[PDB]
Amino acid sequence: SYAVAGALQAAVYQQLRADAVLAALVGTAVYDAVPPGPLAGTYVSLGPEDVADASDKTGAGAVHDFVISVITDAAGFATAKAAAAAVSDALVGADLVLSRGRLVGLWFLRAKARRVEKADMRRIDLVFRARVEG
């Protein structure tokens, strides 16, 4: 990663769990590190980033196509699509504040949505682009 991405994940995690919806759909189950226990089963997960270095002569920036996946164990997955509807409106047009550097925009990209393991879990990825500035 570049210098910003340590604080970019800390900002897009704190923008979640303060959004009013998805505190009523997913609950407290927004985490990178999944805590030990019984695995609630409608969680979201925010880790797999990748950077693209949109830089210049004066300073440097980056383009983060970070992935926020929504997992559900429900029978259908209109539960996950309702949960990622709550993910995406919390992030597009972010106006976040970072700890190191700035971001200028948080857009949306590809969002694959398929059946993952043994046709039982339903995971829907959400790729968001974050053009940041170091």
Next chain:
Amino acid sequence: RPRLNRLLVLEEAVRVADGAGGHRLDWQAKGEVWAEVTAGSGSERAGEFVTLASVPFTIVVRAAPVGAARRPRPEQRFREGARIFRILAVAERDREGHYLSCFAREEVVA
């Protein structure tokens, strides 16, 4: 022949359908059955973004004809307290048909 020593709550989820072709699961409790649970070799498994912890757990209940509530179906699950045993299949151990083989996972997220 099995020593049915452990008590397991059979659980069937009633399937309320939603708008988009799927169902909603709530897992109300069915009756309680007695069964022996025999662990297989357990190890971690790469989950989705979890590091799960699974064990084979062949579970032996008494049998019933197929149109009865005492038959565990593979869409059901067991529960001893807060330990969710899934059911993979049921498979009729004995030649006479006295007992069944349930197959569980019991994957805690570790």
